[PDB]
Every structure is written in C-alpha cells, then in structure tokens.
C-alpha cells in the first residue's frame, strides 16, 4: 500500500474501540440483574446489552 | 478510554515512520481525527458518570478537559512547526514525541478512576514538560525555570503520595467511585489538618496558588510555544481537577481549612492582576494573568458550592482557550521582532489588521465579555462568592476592573499608537498563524451557544 | 592482569558472596566476607596507580574493622546461645555489633566515609562491582537477622544515610563520587523498610543494582568519569545522552519510571505500620538526589556543552566496547513500572 | 452506550472494587495478627532443626 | 518587593542556600583516614552511652 | 536472601558445627547437651516468635 | 558471667579504640587490628574449651588462618604505600579528598 | 513475610501446587508488554551500535522478544502463584481464628446517625 | 539520653518552669556535645584550647537554645493557661531561633531559625498530642 501510514491511527482507534467492547463482556456481572433495569427476556434475545 | 489511548500511542509510529516533509502534516491530520473522536465522551448522564472500566471513567468534569486536551495537540503542532523548521529531523521527531507522550499522560490523568494512578499520571506529566522547556526553550533561564517547575511540583506532591497511600490503607481503596460512597467525615484535629494540607498543596502548586506561583512566570516564559500552550491551557487545570476530586474526602475540615488559602487567592487575584499593569514582558503579562484567573478557580473550589464548581470548570475551559490564544499571539509577534518586550513593537494594527482583530477578540474574552464562557465562569464564581460572603464582591469587582485594564493596555501597547520606525521585518500574517487564532477562538465563541457541556458534573 | 587469573579472582568474589548467601553457620558467613574482600582487593588495584592503592588500603581497613566487629558479634552470640545458626541473635549487644559491622560493609552513614573515596580511587568496572555486588552479602545477613535488629539503630542509620547521601552529591563533579553518594542514599532507603517488609528491601536492591549497572555501563561505554567529559557525549554519540537522561530520571524516582517503583512501595509499607513522618521526610530528602541527577541531565542531554576539535577524529570510529546488557538494563531501569506487581516473586 | 449498559457495568465495577477494598482491609488485619502472635504461616522465622541432634549413647552418661 | 523578592526569598532561595551550605559542610572532608575512624569511634560511643542502642 | 542450597541439594556443608548437641567425635557430650536438646526440641518448627 | 571474659572483651575494646584512633603509622593500625584478632581468638577459645563443644575446637584455627591471610594482604597494601611515599604515614593517603 | 511458607520446600521457583493454578495466557497483556520491552531492547541495541534501528539484525530483535517473553512467562507464573499463596494463607487464617474476625452487623442508614455539616 | 527526653515530657505544661527549663537545657547541652564531638572529629582544631573553645561554644549555644525554648514555652503556657497548645511551642521555638541568631550574631539566620524551629517545635507538640510515631514499631 502506497499510503500504509494513514491507517496507523484509525485502525488503532478501531482495535481500541474493539477492546473497549471486549472489556464490557468482562463487566457483565449485573447484566439484567440490577433492581432498576431487570426485566424478562424478550423472544429472540439472549442478553440485554452487549 | 482505550479508544483514545491507543490512537495517541499510534501517533508515535505515525511520527517516527513518516517522510521528512510529512511529519507535521500527518501528525496534525491524525491528531485532528483523535480530537474529532473526542466528542464521544459527551455520553454523560444526569445521575451517573460514564464509567468505562475498573481503571477509566469520565464524568462531565473530565470530559471538557479531555476534549480540550485532545484539541490542543494539533494547535501545538501548528504553533511549533515554524520555529523548529531549521531543527534536526530526529530532534523534531523527539519534540513531537514529547507532545504526544504528554497528551498520553494527560488523557489518563483526567480519566483515572483510582487516585494513585491519577498521581502517577499527574506526576508523569512533569517529564515531557520538563524536557520540552529545558531542551527547546530559547533563553538561558530555561534550566533554572525547569528546576523551579520540577521542585515546586514534587515538593508539593510527595506529601500527596503519602496522603493517598494513607487513604488507601484506611479506606481500603482509592477508587473515586467507591470513595463517593465510603467517605467518612474528617474531624477537626492536627492529624487531619496535615492530612488536608498533604491532599491540597500539590494542587495549590499546580493551579498556582498565590505565593506558590513563582515557578509559573519562569516556566511559562522560558518555554517554547507548545510548552506554554500546554502549561497554561491544560497543566494548570490538573490542580483544579485534582481539587475537585480530592475535596470529597476532606469534609468537614475544609470548611475552616480553606480560610487562609481563600485570602491568598482573593488578595492574590488583586495583586497578580495589578502586576499585569506594569509588566514589560508580554509573555510574563499573560503568565500573571493566568495566575489571576486561576485564583478564582481556587476560591470556587474552596467554597464548594454548586454554582462555584460550575463556574470553576467553565472558567478553566475558557481560560485554557483564551490563554493559549494569547500565548500564540505573543509568539506571532516574537517570531517577527525576536523580543518579548511589549513596548518594542507598537501600532501593529497599522500593519496586521486581521491579526489585530484576533488580538481584540482574545483581549475581549480575556476581560470576560458576555456572553462568552469566560464571563459565564467569572460570573458564576462571583455569584457563589457573594453567597459565601457579601463583602467579597469588592475584591471581585476591583479585580474585574483591573482584568479589563491589563487586557486593553496589552491591546493598546501592542496594536495601537504609532508604529516603531526602526522595525521593518513585520511580515504579513501567515495562513498558519491566522488558522491557529481561529482554531483557538471559534470553538471558544461556539461554546457560548451551548455552554452546558462545559459546566461540569453538577449542571 | 592475566585473564585466567582475572576469571579465577572474580569467581572467588562470587564464591565469597555465595558462601555468605547459602551457609547456616556464622563462621562460614565470616569466611565468605573474608574471601570476598581478599579476592576483590586486586580488582581495585587493576591499574596500579597510587589512587588505587590508597582506595584499596581504605577499603581494607574499613572492611577489616567490620569483619572483626562481625566476629565479635558472632562470639557474643556464642556466649549467650551456645550455638552457631545464622538466624536471630540472642543478645542486643551482638545485634548492635552486627548491625554496625554490616552498616560498615554497606558503607551506610555515618560509616559512609570510605565509599566516595574508594569509588573515586578505582576504575569504573571495579566501582560497579563495589556498588552492586558488594551489597548482596551484607543485605543477606541483614535479611536473616531482622528479628533481632534494633529498630531505632537501623532507622537512624537509614535516615542518616539518606540525608548524607543527599547532601554529599550536591557538591560533586566526579561521576564516581556521584554514584557513591547515590549508593549511600539508596542503602538508607533499603534499610528503612527492612524491619517492616524485607521483600521491598529486596525490590529496592534489585532495582538499584539495575539502575547502577546501567549508569556504570554507560560511563564505561563512553569512557567518562567527570561531568564535563560526559558533556561531550552528544557530539560523539547522541543516543547515550538519551540513555543517561532516562536512567538519571529513573534513579531520581520520577514516575512513570522504574526507580519510582521501590521508594513508592517503601512508603506503601511504612504507612501500613503507622509511620507517616518518616517516609515523608525520606521522600523529601530524596529530592536532593534528584537535584544532582538533574544537574547531570542538564550537563549531558538537555543542553549541549561545547566540544573540542579532536572529537571530529572520534566520529570516524564506532564504539568497539562490549556494552554487555546495556539495552536490557536500559529498558529494565526505565519501563518497568507497569510490571510493579512482579515484586511478589521476591516474597 | 445505553444507560442500562453503563449502569450495570458501573455496578460490576463497584462490586469488584468493593471486594478488593474489603480484602485489602482483611490483609492488613491478618498481617497485624500474624506478626503479633506468630501462629500463622507468615513471619515464621527459623529455629534450630531438631533433626541435627545426636541421640546416641555418649561417652559420659549424664546428658 | 513581593513576587520578585520576598515570595522568591522565603520558599526557594533560603532552602537552596541551606542545601548549598549543608552540601559544603558534608563534603569538606580532608581525606584523612585518622579523622574518619575517630568519627567512627565517636559514633560507637554515642551509640552505646548516649543513645543506648545495645540495651 | 538465604538461598537454602544445602537443603535443596541435601548436602551438609556446615550443619554439623552448628549446635553442641549434634554428632560429635567419639560421642563427646557438651556440658550443656541436655539443656540445648530440650530447648531445640521445644522450639522446633513453631517459629521464632512463638519460640521466644 | 566469668571474670576472664571481662578482660578479654576489654582487651578487644582497647585494641578497637587503638584501631579507631590513628597516630601516624599504618603498621600500628595493622597491629591494633591483629590485637583485635588475637582477643577474638582467646575469647572463642575459652568459650569452646569451657563448653566442651568439641567440633568448634577447629573454629579458632580457622579464625587464625583466614585472618592471618588477611594480615598478609594488609602488609602488602602497606608495602605498596611504602613503595609510593617512602613511609607508611596515613596522612600521605589523602589524594581521594578531591 | 511469607518466609516460613517457602522454606519447607526451599529454592523451588514453581512448586507443584503452582500447577493447580491456571497459567497466564500467551495473549496476556503483561506478557505482551514484556515482549514490547524485548522489542525496545532490540531497538536500543541497534541504536547504541549505530545500526539501522528497525532493519538491522531481525534475528537479534526476534531473540530479544523471544527471551523476554520466555523469561516473563515464568515470572508471571511465579507472581500469580505468590498472590495465590497470599490469599490462601489469608483465608485459612481467617477461618482458623473466628475470635479475631467477627461478623459485623451492617446497620442501614435509617438507624445510622451522621452529623450534617452545611456548606454555606 | 533517652531518659532526658522522658524527664522533659514528664512535667505537665505550665506547671514547673525551672525543671522544664533545666531539662531542655540538658537536652540542648547533650546535643551540643554531640555536635562538638563530631566537629572536632571531622575537622581538626589547631590546638587543644581551640578544640575545647569550639566545644564550649557549640555546647553553650545549643544549651542556651534549649533553655530559652523551655523558658518561653512554659511561660507562654502559664500566662495563656493552655497546656496542650502547640502555639506555646511555636513561640518557644521562635525564641530559640532568635537565640541561635544572637549566638551566630546575625538577623537573617535568626528569622530563619525562628520560623523553621518554631514549626518544628509545633510539629513535635502535635506529635505528642496525637501520638505521631517517627520510630514506629512494625505492626504488619
Ligand atoms: C534468566 C535470566 C537471563 C539474564 C540474561 C542472560 C544473558 C546475559 C548474561 C551473559 C551475557 O552477557 O550474555 C550476552 C547476552 C546478550 O548481551 P549483549 O552482549 O548486550 O547482546 C547484544 C547483542 O546480542 C550483540 O549481538 P552479537 O552480534 O554480538 O550477537 C547476537 C546474539 C546471538 O545470540 C546467540 O548467540 C544466542 C545463542 C547462544 C546461547 C546458548 C546456546 C547453546 O543475539 C542475542 O544475544 C540477542 C539478544 C538476546 C536477549 C538478551 C537478554 C536476555 C533476556 C534477559 C532477561 C529479561 C528479563 C525480563 C523481565 C521483565 C519483567 C520483570 O546473551 C546472549 O548473547 C544470549 C541470550 C540468550 C537468552 C536466553 C534466555 C533464556 C535462557 C534459558
Ligand atoms: C534550621 C533553621 C535555620 C538554621 C540554619 C541557617 C542556615 C545555616 C547557617 O547558620 O549559616 C551560617 C553559617 C555560614 O553561612 P552564611 O555565610 O551566613 O550564608 C548565608 C548568607 O550570609 C546570606 O545571608 P543571611 O545569613 O542573612 O541569610 C541566610 C538565610 C536567611 O534568610 C534571610 O535572611 C531572608 C529570609 C528571611 C528568613 C527566612 C524566613 C523563612 C520563613 C519560612 C518559610 C515559609 C513558611 C511559610 C509558613 C506559612 C504558614 C505559617 O537563611 C537561609 O538561607 C537558611 C534557611 C533555613 C535553613 C533550613 C531550611 C531547611 C528546609 C528544609 C525543607 C522544609 O553556616 C553554618 O555555620 C552552617 C551550620 C549552621 C549551624 C547550625 C544552625 C542551627 C541548626 C539547629 C537545628 C536545626 C535542625 C533542623 C530544623 C529544620 C528541619 C526540621
Ligand atoms: C538529647 C541528646 C540526643 C539528641 C539526638 C542526637 C544528637 C544528634 C542530632 C542529629 C545529628 C546532628 C548532627 C551531628 C553532628 C554535627 C555535624 C558536624 O560534625 O558539624 C561539623 C561540621 C561543620 O563545620 P564546617 O563544615 O567546618 O563549617 C562550619 C563553619 O565553620 C561555622 O559553623 P558554626 O560555628 O556556625 O556551626 C557549625 C555547627 C555548630 O552547630 C551547633 O552549634 C548546633 C548545635 C545544635 C543546636 C540546636 C539544638 C536543638 C535541640 C532541641 C531543642 C531543645 C529542647 C527540646 C525539647 C524536646 C522537644 C520539645 O553546625 C552544625 O554542625 C550544623 C549541621 C548539622 C545539623 C545539626 C542539627 C542538630 C539538631 C539537634 C536536635 C536534638 O560539619 C561536618 O563535619 C559535617 C559532616 C559530618 C558527617 C557525620 C555526621 C554524623 C552525625 C551522627 C549523629 C547521630 C549518631 C547516631 C549514632 C547511632 C547510629 C550509628
Ligand atoms: C520504542 C521505544 C524505544 C526505542 C529505542 C530506539 C529508538 C531509535 O533509535 O529510534 C531511531 C529511529 C529512526 O532513526 P534512525 O535513522 O533509524 O537511527 C537513529 C538516527 O541516527 C538518529 O540520529 P542521531 O542519533 O545521529 O542524532 C539525533 C539524536 C537526537 O537526540 C538528541 O538530540 C538528544 C536528546 C534530545 C532531547 C531529549 C528528548 C527526549 C528523550 C528522552 C525521552 C524521555 C521520555 C520518555 C518517557 C518519560 C520518562 C523518562 O539521537 C537520536 O535520535 C538517537 C535515536 C533515539 C531517538 C528516540 C529515543 C527512544 C528511546 C528513549 C525513549 C523510550 C524508552 C524510555 C521510556 C521511559 C518510560 C516510558 O526511530 C525509530 O525507529 C522509532 C520506532 C519506529 C517504529 C516503532 C514500531 C513499534 C512496533 C510495536 C509493535 C511490535 C513489537 C511487538 C512486541 C510484542 C510482541 C509480543
Ligand atoms: C509546596 C511545598 C510545601 C508542601 C506542603 C505539603 C503539605 C504540608 C504538610 C505536610 C506534612 C507531611 C505529610 C502529611 C501526611 C498526612 C497523612 C496522615 O496520615 O496524616 C495523619 C497522621 C496522624 O498519624 P496516624 O494517622 O498514623 O495516627 C493514628 C490516628 N490517631 C491520630 C487518632 C492516633 O499525621 C502524622 O503522622 C504526621 C502528619 C504531619 C507530618 C509532619 C512532618 C513533615 C513536615 C512538613 C513537610 C512540609 C513539606 C516539605 C517540603 C517543603 C519544600 C521543600
Ligand atoms: C508562604 C507562601 C505563600 C503561602 C503558601 C501556603 C503556605 C501555608 C499553608 C498552611 C497555612 C496554615 C495552616 C492552615 C490554617 C488552618 C487554620 C488554623 O490553623 O488556624 C489557626 C489556629 C486556630 O486554632 P485551631 O484551628 O482551633 O487549632 C486546633 C485544631 N484542632 O491556631 C493555632 O492553633 C495556633 C497555631 C498552631 C501552629 C500551627 C502550625 C502548623 C500550620 C502552619 C504550617
Ligand atoms: C569538653 C572537653 C573536650 C576535649 C576535646 C576537645 C579538644 C580538642 O579537640 O583537642 C585537640 C585534639 C588534637 O590535638 P592537637 O593539639 O590539635 O594536635 C596537634 C599536636 N599537638 O583533638 C583530638 O584529639 C580530637 C579527638 C578528641 C575527642 C573527641 C570526643 C570527645 C570530646 C568532645 C565532646 C565533649
Ligand atoms: C519536620 C520535622 C517534624 C518532626 C515531628 C515530630 C513529632 C513528634 C513525635 C515524637 C513525640 O514527641 O512523641 C511523643 C512521645 C511521648 O508519648 P509516648 O509515645 O506515650 O511516649 C512514652 C514512651 N513509652 O515521645 C516520644 O516518643 C519520645 C520523645 C520524642 C521527642 C521528639 C523531639 C525531641 C527533640 C529533638 C530530637
């Protein structure tokens, strides 16, 4: 690629964004378990947030 | 926050692998892309902060500081590429790497959920700033100024280290989210007196407190332009951010420990403003004006009312933009006359009319003209200190006279009168310089349309 | 020196330190210290000038006095316990004499008065051996007798070492005396946390040996013994100025560097034991060490002192010196703070 | 992010950090009690091994 | 008077002169082995009789 | 750092001269053999803090 | 404790304070150091004989041998100083003040 | 502190019960940071001998990365082992001494009286 | 000289002025003898008379500092009737600092010693009050 250097910061964004989403699944202890937001699962659904 | 940490780190291979004619343009482009992405921090809620992980979070206090931090890096690159044009290529890349490393320390200073990680990043911000001042400053006094900047900060902050580890042992944690809910009242004692001093004096040095401010009209004067921009726009605000995080743990003792410091600020903003009436060095005039404006943020944090915290964070963001623009204007003259003496080059509206319009707008936002966010923060601190004591308005209002008087005298000396005859190298304003002025001023005026994003955690 | 004789003598230095580390009898402790001194004397007299003979004489006298006080502490332990196990001592007089002997062998203040002379009198490699390898055996004996070490004595030695190693380096221009007063201050930091948590003592010792070995390796790689000859390094090798910059900022304990790692942990172990004034005054006194480190960084990396004309000849030759582990020790002395919880491997 | 996602993520963070804080306080109390009493596995400074003692009949009987 | 002299005098200048003077008192030793061991003797005597670090 | 090489390798470099109650030439007892045997067998394994 | 142990300890402290207060000669310092070693030999010997601790009887000989080897090393250092200045005066050993 | 625990089996870098613990992953961020330290060591080694920093000695840089990852994997195993031993001894001591660790009654804030301090 | 500090602290404040003054005089005299001993150790005097003159000068200086410290502190605690008050040791430490400046025949050293020794004596009083430990026993 003639402009390989102009993807170092955006891919480093996306990967970083990716890792943030990947951290959220480690902090999913109280997903659909808080007293404010707990509810019954709608059909064709397995988690409330991802 | 890892979506902002990793692009800031990828700016390091972006600046070390670029072609020699390309290392400014690529870093400016991608730092502007990071600053465009910085608006995703504005997912703020009326009840909860935006809590990313165990390590990182952001409420509405850190969010304007983060957007200002990620916005200041392209502006520092624009400001610092002219006077480092003749520089060696590897030293130029080391300069850009120091600015990138400083931004990398700052964005996880403001988002540190835990207070000793806040301390580690907060003191990691010394090393790129110290290296920038003592390596790319212009005059002889930059070594001494780097020593003062280093050893006021560390002498204030190494008690803060002991204090934070003491809170770590006593409460079990230094998570700010835990310490919102486990904070105990701090009773009157001598133990808690020196506890309060060890928590507060590092940030008093960082603001600066009047009487501790002696590092600032050296370190902000003996620095290059990017160093002055990051010092007066971000690094003075680490103190206010740290006080707004740390006075949670210091109640109710703060309600009488604040009384000397408030005096030191309420009289200090009278003195330092008055010092700006009789300064010959324009960069030192902007430095003592920075001390004068940050004294109001010290008073507003120490009276700890909601209107005071709203005005203090508004005044910190507004002073960051305003003082950074004023240092850039002083550099726009200093690149032409090669002297920081304010009486040297006069009558510059006769030669640089659009740049004189930029001087006019920066001086009007300096004197807190409504409805700029400068005036919003100024006015809200005045409201809260009037509720604190009805007499303080005198010391406020007299300050609001002198704040006008140095802001226009600086305009009258530099831009008005008859021009200096023997100076004939006054070039027309480059497109880079006016671009830098507009990227300072147009966000500052657009924030008057929607000030609620720079009003902090308790809007 | 014959290289075979040099190898056998250095293995004998190592063998003396090992016999101190691994033995269970106090006579073998004393024997390991005797073997260590007896073998390290020719390493100090490697170049055969009157300064090395003076340094080796002063080193011999202080280490011989310490060895005799050590044996008197051992013999008093034999009086009051009838046995010889290397463990706690069974008399506070024997504890005081052994703490004095080991403070002399470490050169902690006020027995520091040999360390800046002897380090100035010997070459840089033997100064590296003296300031890194010769700490390991007395700190091991202090590690094993800490149930009997008096608190007030070892803390007085610690704060007196930190203050004297702070004020000593502020007047110096010779790099070996700077490293020696840095040594005194760091030994104060290591023994201030010995009775509270000896794992942080081992941590501070390892991080100190890494940073000291980095600085002596840089001084050997540039052949620099004074400040003013270290100031010519930017015109000879500009990478070495960055290396001494980051390593001197690390030895001052500035975060995010690795030398912030021990002292912070030391404070972290001294406030759990309800000492607040003491780590505060220790950390305030460490700013003096930081100040003469900053003096060296101003002379070397952050400014450019004027060079001479003959430097242009030295541009035409690369450094053929074996810079053993210098990138490794440079990395491990600067970028190690994110791996701070590795210290549990020393428990 | 949703307010649900941030809210319950915050609660997971708070549970992890509160458990770490309670364990740090317990670690301080355990170290205090073990250094005071010496009956735990920590602070076990050595005494003489009794596997070194000779138990043979000696040259003189009164021993 | 205040922000070029007195606030400059009290915190940085007096502390800097104090560190300079203590640095010159520590490092003014004549390199004499006799005096260093006489100081070590006075150390041991103050340790035993004056501070009771052996009791 | 007491690197306990003697227990790791199973060698007896210096444990034999360490106490008076150890194995002696011609089974010569020390004058305080019994008292040291009692103090060691009391204090064995329980740690030094409890042994004091 | 025993009355002879008082005198052997006091002899060690006398030779200590002689070794800790120089006059001029490095040889007098070496003699004070070996007086310290001799007093350690005597004290260790009287304990080991007094306790009938048989295996430590080889201990003072070891305490002799090593330290006498140490003494030999010290004599060589003196000679090298004596080969530089003609005398063994400790005030000639002051080059390391600067 | 834990000197009596690792004294019955002396000089064991990883004891047998360390095998009961899950090892660090090969995608451990700590291990990747140690690999980055190896890469920086390779770059400093090219810089101090005036080689082309990114290009020269790729076998040497790869052995730097390999050696730091290899040593750091065992160092992380020992780190995780020692914190596991720390928590195990903590919990066994809390279980073995209930007279020192009472279960404290958690009062609700309807009963808990705190003094109010007004900001005015 | 551990019992010297104890017999200084055993008398309550503002109660027995003479023995407090004597105890602080004796503590200052001990500290002055320590400074004198190390001073004639590391710096050789030109004569025995010069050595005992340096010893008497430093011992009398530090003893006068201690005497005027204890006197000013106890008289301030008497006339203010506040025994557990660190302002009393602040005034006493500043009086000892003026004493050190009068012994060194200089006013700048006097003001510096006033400020730093007054803050030091105030910190020592606060450490006596809230139980601050400098040589803290290992607990964990
Ligand atoms: C365990 C602790 C290990 C501690 C370090 C051990 C080595 C240092 C001590 C001896 C020494 O000086 O050796 C020289 C030393 C390199 O030091 P140097 O002179 O500065 O090297 C510069 C260039 O290598 C000069 O280039 P050259 O052209 O002259 O030779 C190229 C050379 C050629 O290499 C070879 O020839 C290798 C093959 C020979 C080995 C034996 C084969 C039989 O390449 C290399 O050596 C590449 C560098 C390898 C890395 C060196 C450092 C190792 C890791 C240190 C510990 C890191 C801990 C991190 C912890 C962080 C978290 C707390 O080591 C080697 O040459 C071999 C390293 C092998 C590492 C194996 C690690 C696992 C062992 C099990
Ligand atoms: C310590 C107390 C001061 C005593 C030492 C003074 C300096 C050395 C001296 O005597 O030099 C004369 C002499 C020769 O020096 P020189 O020729 O006069 O050089 C000065 C020039 O003449 C220049 O003319 P000058 O003599 O008129 O001016 C000297 C200047 C005097 O300054 C002035 O004349 C202008 C400034 C006014 C006075 C200073 C005001 C400071 C206010 C406090 C700071 C702000 C606090 C804010 C608090 C707000 C809330 C209340 O004083 C200094 O620069 C020294 C400042 C204090 C020294 C200790 C600082 C430690 C700081 C550690 C971090 C905290 O040096 C010696 O003989 C060396 C040995 C000194 C003898 C022993 C002195 C008494 C020690 C008693 C025990 C102290 C233990 C430690 C206490 C503190 C830590 C717990
Ligand atoms: C109760 C008894 C126990 C108390 C605690 C223990 C006592 C020691 C305190 C801490 C150590 C302080 C320094 C001691 C040595 C003195 C320095 C010296 O040799 O100066 C000569 C010399 C200075 O002469 P120079 O350089 O030729 O120039 C001077 C000018 O010609 C002209 O100079 P000048 O005529 O103006 O004056 C020169 C000299 C004269 O100094 C004086 O006359 C000042 C004497 C003390 C005045 C203040 C006393 C305040 C007492 C507390 C308040 C009383 C009431 C308290 C009530 C309870 C609390 C409420 O000034 C100095 O030496 C100042 C520098 C050292 C700071 C002294 C701070 C003393 C604080 C005492 C607190 C207690 O300095 C040196 O040679 C420096 C190198 C020395 C290195 C070795 C030092 C070892 C010290 C070890 C002490 C602890 C041993 C522990 C043994 C166990 C562990 C191994
Ligand atoms: C990376 C960091 C360490 C790099 C060391 C080597 C740097 C170097 O030589 O660069 C030159 C080289 C370009 O130059 P060159 O033409 O090849 O040769 C050198 C020239 O001759 C240069 O011309 P010259 O030597 O003739 O004269 C100019 C002079 C210019 O110098 C001067 O004029 C003197 C000094 C000027 C003022 C001081 C500036 C600041 C310097 C100190 C930095 C302090 C801040 C660090 C943090 C704060 C705490 C201290 O000297 C240099 O420029 C020498 C080259 C070194 C420059 C960069 C220094 C980096 C090392 C120090 C910072 C990093 C380590 C410490 C970090 C501490 C804790 C975070 O730059 C690069 O190659 C940069 C790296 C670009 C690619 C990065 C790829 C990263 C990939 C990561 C993923 C892959 C690995 C995965 C691992 C895990 C697997 C599981
Ligand atoms: C900018 C330069 C100046 C910086 C000033 C920084 C703040 C000023 C005061 C700092 C005091 C030292 C840190 C205090 C930490 C308190 C933590 C704590 O647990 O406190 C309660 C503890 C109380 O002890 P405790 O909490 O362990 O006791 C148990 C609780 N009670 C009390 C009920 C029994 O306080 C202390 O132990 C002592 C506090 C005061 C320490 C005084 C020594 C330092 C002297 C002043 C140094 C000033 C700065 C030096 C640099 C100047 C320039 C070079
Ligand atoms: C210089 C540069 C510019 C300035 C930069 C900042 C430097 C100063 C920073 C600290 C300012 C002083 C400390 C904070 C003041 C808090 C209020 C206070 O102390 O009031 C005076 C006090 C009144 O008594 P009270 O507060 O009731 O004391 C009992 C406490 N339970 O009065 C007393 O108790 C009597 C006096 C006691 C001594 C106090 C000494 C320690 C504090 C100063 C250091
Ligand atoms: C109070 C009494 C103090 C007595 C000791 C001080 C007198 C002194 O220092 O005397 C000088 C003496 C060196 O003798 P001098 O004459 O200088 O040598 C040249 C040849 N005539 O100096 C010495 O001998 C130095 C060592 C003397 C002992 C120091 C410790 C005790 C005295 C100080 C505390 C009291
Ligand atoms: C900057 C420098 C700041 C220095 C702050 C020092 C704070 C004072 C701490 C020491 C203190 O005064 O502690 C009080 C204590 C008396 O109380 P207590 O612990 O009960 O003593 C009985 C002993 N079983 O007393 C003691 O522990 C012993 C006496 C200590 C006196 C310290 C000052 C003496 C003079 C200078 C040396």
PDB file of N, CA, C and O in Angstrom, chain C residues 18-35:
ATOM      1  N   UNK C  18      28.453 -16.032  47.580  1.00  0.00           N
ATOM      2  CA  UNK C  18      27.599 -17.220  47.622  1.00  0.00           C
ATOM      3  C   UNK C  18      27.707 -17.925  48.970  1.00  0.00           C
ATOM      4  O   UNK C  18      26.690 -18.322  49.548  1.00  0.00           O
ATOM      5  N   UNK C  19      28.923 -18.059  49.507  1.00  0.00           N
ATOM      6  CA  UNK C  19      29.113 -18.690  50.812  1.00  0.00           C
ATOM      7  C   UNK C  19      28.472 -17.860  51.922  1.00  0.00           C
ATOM      8  O   UNK C  19      27.963 -18.418  52.899  1.00  0.00           O
ATOM      9  N   UNK C  20      28.400 -16.538  51.763  1.00  0.00           N
ATOM     10  CA  UNK C  20      27.579 -15.762  52.692  1.00  0.00           C
ATOM     11  C   UNK C  20      26.094 -16.075  52.493  1.00  0.00           C
ATOM     12  O   UNK C  20      25.343 -16.224  53.463  1.00  0.00           O
ATOM     13  N   UNK C  21      25.656 -16.230  51.247  1.00  0.00           N
ATOM     14  CA  UNK C  21      24.224 -16.389  50.997  1.00  0.00           C
ATOM     15  C   UNK C  21      23.676 -17.750  51.412  1.00  0.00           C
ATOM     16  O   UNK C  21      22.517 -17.835  51.826  1.00  0.00           O
ATOM     17  N   UNK C  22      24.462 -18.819  51.312  1.00  0.00           N
ATOM     18  CA  UNK C  22      23.906 -20.167  51.364  1.00  0.00           C
ATOM     19  C   UNK C  22      24.236 -20.901  52.646  1.00  0.00           C
ATOM     20  O   UNK C  22      23.742 -22.017  52.844  1.00  0.00           O
ATOM     21  N   UNK C  23      25.046 -20.328  53.524  1.00  0.00           N
ATOM     22  CA  UNK C  23      25.546 -21.061  54.676  1.00  0.00           C
ATOM     23  C   UNK C  23      24.687 -20.833  55.911  1.00  0.00           C
ATOM     24  O   UNK C  23      24.008 -19.815  56.045  1.00  0.00           O
ATOM     25  N   UNK C  24      24.740 -21.804  56.821  1.00  0.00           N
ATOM     26  CA  UNK C  24      23.924 -21.839  58.026  1.00  0.00           C
ATOM     27  C   UNK C  24      24.754 -21.698  59.290  1.00  0.00           C
ATOM     28  O   UNK C  24      24.233 -21.892  60.389  1.00  0.00           O
ATOM     29  N   UNK C  25      26.028 -21.355  59.158  1.00  0.00           N
ATOM     30  CA  UNK C  25      26.959 -21.266  60.268  1.00  0.00           C
ATOM     31  C   UNK C  25      27.623 -19.903  60.195  1.00  0.00           C
ATOM     32  O   UNK C  25      27.992 -19.454  59.109  1.00  0.00           O
ATOM     33  N   UNK C  26      27.750 -19.236  61.341  1.00  0.00           N
ATOM     34  CA  UNK C  26      28.274 -17.873  61.356  1.00  0.00           C
ATOM     35  C   UNK C  26      29.740 -17.804  60.962  1.00  0.00           C
ATOM     36  O   UNK C  26      30.189 -16.776  60.430  1.00  0.00           O
ATOM     37  N   UNK C  27      30.499 -18.867  61.231  1.00  0.00           N
ATOM     38  CA  UNK C  27      31.892 -18.907  60.809  1.00  0.00           C
ATOM     39  C   UNK C  27      31.994 -18.905  59.296  1.00  0.00           C
ATOM     40  O   UNK C  27      32.882 -18.264  58.735  1.00  0.00           O
ATOM     41  N   UNK C  28      31.053 -19.554  58.614  1.00  0.00           N
ATOM     42  CA  UNK C  28      31.091 -19.547  57.159  1.00  0.00           C
ATOM     43  C   UNK C  28      30.613 -18.218  56.593  1.00  0.00           C
ATOM     44  O   UNK C  28      31.027 -17.836  55.495  1.00  0.00           O
ATOM     45  N   UNK C  29      29.778 -17.492  57.340  1.00  0.00           N
ATOM     46  CA  UNK C  29      29.429 -16.119  56.978  1.00  0.00           C
ATOM     47  C   UNK C  29      30.670 -15.238  57.006  1.00  0.00           C
ATOM     48  O   UNK C  29      30.970 -14.511  56.045  1.00  0.00           O
ATOM     49  N   UNK C  30      31.409 -15.303  58.118  1.00  0.00           N
ATOM     50  CA  UNK C  30      32.640 -14.536  58.265  1.00  0.00           C
ATOM     51  C   UNK C  30      33.681 -14.946  57.229  1.00  0.00           C
ATOM     52  O   UNK C  30      34.390 -14.095  56.683  1.00  0.00           O
ATOM     53  N   UNK C  31      33.750 -16.242  56.920  1.00  0.00           N
ATOM     54  CA  UNK C  31      34.660 -16.755  55.899  1.00  0.00           C
ATOM     55  C   UNK C  31      34.286 -16.235  54.519  1.00  0.00           C
ATOM     56  O   UNK C  31      35.161 -15.877  53.723  1.00  0.00           O
ATOM     57  N   UNK C  32      32.990 -16.145  54.224  1.00  0.00           N
ATOM     58  CA  UNK C  32      32.575 -15.618  52.936  1.00  0.00           C
ATOM     59  C   UNK C  32      32.883 -14.143  52.780  1.00  0.00           C
ATOM     60  O   UNK C  32      33.297 -13.700  51.706  1.00  0.00           O
ATOM     61  N   UNK C  33      32.735 -13.371  53.860  1.00  0.00           N
ATOM     62  CA  UNK C  33      33.146 -11.967  53.801  1.00  0.00           C
ATOM     63  C   UNK C  33      34.660 -11.815  53.661  1.00  0.00           C
ATOM     64  O   UNK C  33      35.132 -10.941  52.915  1.00  0.00           O
ATOM     65  N   UNK C  34      35.436 -12.660  54.354  1.00  0.00           N
ATOM     66  CA  UNK C  34      36.894 -12.629  54.227  1.00  0.00           C
ATOM     67  C   UNK C  34      37.345 -12.984  52.819  1.00  0.00           C
ATOM     68  O   UNK C  34      38.237 -12.333  52.262  1.00  0.00           O
ATOM     69  N   UNK C  35      36.734 -14.014  52.234  1.00  0.00           N
ATOM     70  CA  UNK C  35      37.053 -14.426  50.873  1.00  0.00           C
ATOM     71  C   UNK C  35      36.673 -13.347  49.872  1.00  0.00           C
ATOM     72  O   UNK C  35      37.418 -13.089  48.918  1.00  0.00           O
TER      73      UNK C  35
END
